[PDB]
Amino acid sequence: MLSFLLTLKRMLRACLRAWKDKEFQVLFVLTILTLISGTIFYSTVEGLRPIDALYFSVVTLTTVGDGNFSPQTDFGKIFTILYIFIGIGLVFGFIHKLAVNVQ
Amino acid sequence: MLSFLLTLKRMLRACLRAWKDKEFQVLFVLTILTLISGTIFYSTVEGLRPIDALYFSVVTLTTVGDGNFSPQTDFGKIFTILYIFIGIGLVFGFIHKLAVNVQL
Amino acid sequence: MLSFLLTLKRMLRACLRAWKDKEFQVLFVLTILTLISGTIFYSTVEGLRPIDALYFSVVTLTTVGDGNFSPQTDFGKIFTILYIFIGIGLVFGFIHKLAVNVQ
Amino acid sequence: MLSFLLTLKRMLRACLRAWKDKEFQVLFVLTILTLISGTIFYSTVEGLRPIDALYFSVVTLTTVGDGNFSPQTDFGKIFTILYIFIGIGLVFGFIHKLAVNVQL
Ligand SMILES: [Ca+2]
Ligand code: NA
Ligand code: NA
Ligand code: NA
Ligand code: NA
């Protein structure tokens, strides 16, 4: 259906118009930076391969969770605690953003 | 008790009434496609029985998560990372939608 | 601080004013009903004690997840799939509700 | 690049500016209290080392979840059920707040 494509394209255009908003770019860079930091930390402190440090960082920051790995060191546990709250602060940031864009 | 039933039906209607919004429909289709790709990827790449691939696909895309399975290959891990962001993208889409539908 | 208590009490009052809203009561009954159904299903089909069937139902419907139990039967997996989407439909229901209450 | 920094600071300000809302403060305090009770309960009832009880408390209240630990006692299971709903109650509170702060 042509209607379907046109509607999708419009939506895709509206989505791309967000990656041009400064506040969104910030939130975006911040989560990327957060993901990098997590990758480094877990790779360093918990001794995970970079790929598994990124996976755990992603899965943790998004609340998906990992069914097998749990931080083994106390420093890792403390970091994960703060990491999770950064993630929540980030999502509220995006939520609030989407909220204001409805005004 | 009657009020409950009447409210339920009124709300239920509004829900099905939302299944009429073209943008909602696309979000929905996108989710199904996402779920199918996921099922295909995990069955193929991770060798999970089809039903187990849809399950992992569903619990992962919804952030529920699976307490026993985690992708075993680097290809799976990378795919899952992106898969998850697709899901978050889809949820914000629905939320943005619900937000717009509240304001007009 | 008296200010703190008064603010909390006001918030608590506003929260209780929700349990009087018909649409909220519905959403509330529905999730309770959903939790009951899950408890029954998992207790029956997956052979979990009622307490563990409720736990898994709660943890699943809220996206928290269980780090040890995963449905063992195909019927359980299919049910959990639909169960999760009911849960998401429920949360959007509450979200939409809170959204309209901001108007 | 300068715009980025200027936007970051403007946003950062608004965040700290929100740490001034009495209702936000209460939500925050409630969360900490919730996290402390949780830490106490799981250390006491489930016998988890304190730091492990705060961790489980945090990942559970945020729906992230723990892939290795699950409460072993019926008392823990029941408490966790309620703990989770408290967390959902708190999140809707914050969301309701963010919603009101957007409209005025
Ligand atoms: Ca596990
Ligand atoms: Na969530
Ligand atoms: Na999990
Ligand atoms: Na989870
Ligand atoms: Na989650």
Mutation site for A-interface testing, chosen from D34, D62, D68, D92 by largest number of A Cβ within 10 Å: D62
Q: Where are the beta strands (DSSP E) in chain B?
A: none
Q: How many contacts, defined by CB atoms under 8 Å, are there between B and C?
A: 69
- Report the SS3 class of residue C65: coil
| Neighbouring C-alpha atoms within 13 Å toward the C-beta of A59 | 30
SS3 percent helix, strand, coil of chain A, rounded to 5, is: 75, 0, 25
For chain D, how are helix, strand and coil distributed in percent, rounded to 5? 80, 0, 20
A chain contacts of residue B67, beta-carbon cutoff 8 Å? 67
Number of DSSP helices (H) and strands (E) in chain D, helices first: 4, 0
Q: What angle do CA B82, B85, B90 make, to 5 degrees?
A: 130
A1-60 residues touching B, CB cutoff 8 A: 3-4, 7-8, 11, 15, 51-52, 54-55, 58-59
Taking residue A75's Cβ as centre, other Cβ atoms within 10 Å add up to: 12
CB A60 within 8 A of CB A90: no
Query: How far away is chain A from the Cα of B13, in angstroms, using its nearest Cα?
Result: 23
Cα distance between residue B35 and residue B83, in whole Å: 9
Give the separation between CA D70 and CA D80, rounded to whole angstroms: 9
Cβ within 8 Å, pair B23-A4: no
The distance of C40 to chain D (nearest Cα, Å) reads 16
Residue C99 distance to chain B (closest CA, Å): 7
Please, is C41 exposed, middle or buried when counting C-beta atoms within 10 Å of its C-beta (0-12, 13-18, 19+)? buried
Query: What spatial distance separates the first Cα and last Cα of chain B, rounded to whole Å?
Result: 32
Q: How many Å lie between the alpha carbon of D75 and the closest alpha carbon of chain A?
A: 23
The rounded radius of gyration (Å) of the Cα atoms in chain A is 17
Which residues have C-beta within 8 Å of that of residue B10, sequence separation ≥ 6?
Answer: none
Across D23-94, where does the E strand assignment appear?
A: none
CATH T-level topology, domain D1-104 = Helix Hairpins (1.10.287)
The Cα C23–Cα C34 span in angstroms is 16
Name the nearest CA neighbour of C85 among B94, D6, D104, B59: B59
Q: In angstroms, what CA-CA distances link B70 with A44, B48, C62?
A: 21, 11, 20
Residue A62 alpha carbon to ligand 3 centre in Å: 12
Residues of C in contact with A63 (CB under 8 A): 63
For residue C66, give the chain A residue with the closest CA.
A67
Report residue C63 as tokens. Answer: 């996206």
SS3 for A19-31 is CCCHHHHHHHHHH
d(CA B22, CA B18): 9
Set of chain D residues whose Cβ sits within 8 Å of the Cβ of C8: 26, 30
Residue type, B34: T
Q: Which residues of B touch D96 (CB under 8 A)?
A: none
Ligand 2 center–CA B62 separation, angstroms: 8
Q: How far apart (Å, rounded) are the C-alpha atoms in residues D41 and D54?
A: 10
Q: Which ligand is nearest to the CA of B68?
A: 1
Chain B touching partners, 3 or more CB pairs below 8 A: A, C, D
Q: Domain coordinates of chain B in residue numbers? A: 1-104
CA-closest candidate to residue D89, choices D61, D64, D66: D61
d(CA D40, CA D37): 5
The angle that helices D74-103 and C50-61 make with each other, rounded to 10 degrees, is: 20
**What is the CB neighbour count within 10 angstroms for residue A1?**
8
**B2 CB-contact burial (10 Å; exposed 0-12 / middle 13-18 / buried 19+):** exposed
Cα C75 to Cα A41, A47, C15, C80, D5: the distances in Å are 40, 39, 38, 9, 53
Q: Does C65 touch chain A (CB under 8 A)?
A: yes
- Cα-to-chain-centroid distance, residue D37: 12
What is the length of chain A? 103
- H or E segment at A62? none
> How many CB atoms lie under 10 A from the CB of residue C38?
22
| Residues C96 and B14 sit within 8 Å (Cβ to Cβ) | no
| The one-letter amino acid at B40 | I
- CATH architecture of residue range(s) A1-103: Orthogonal Bundle (1.10)
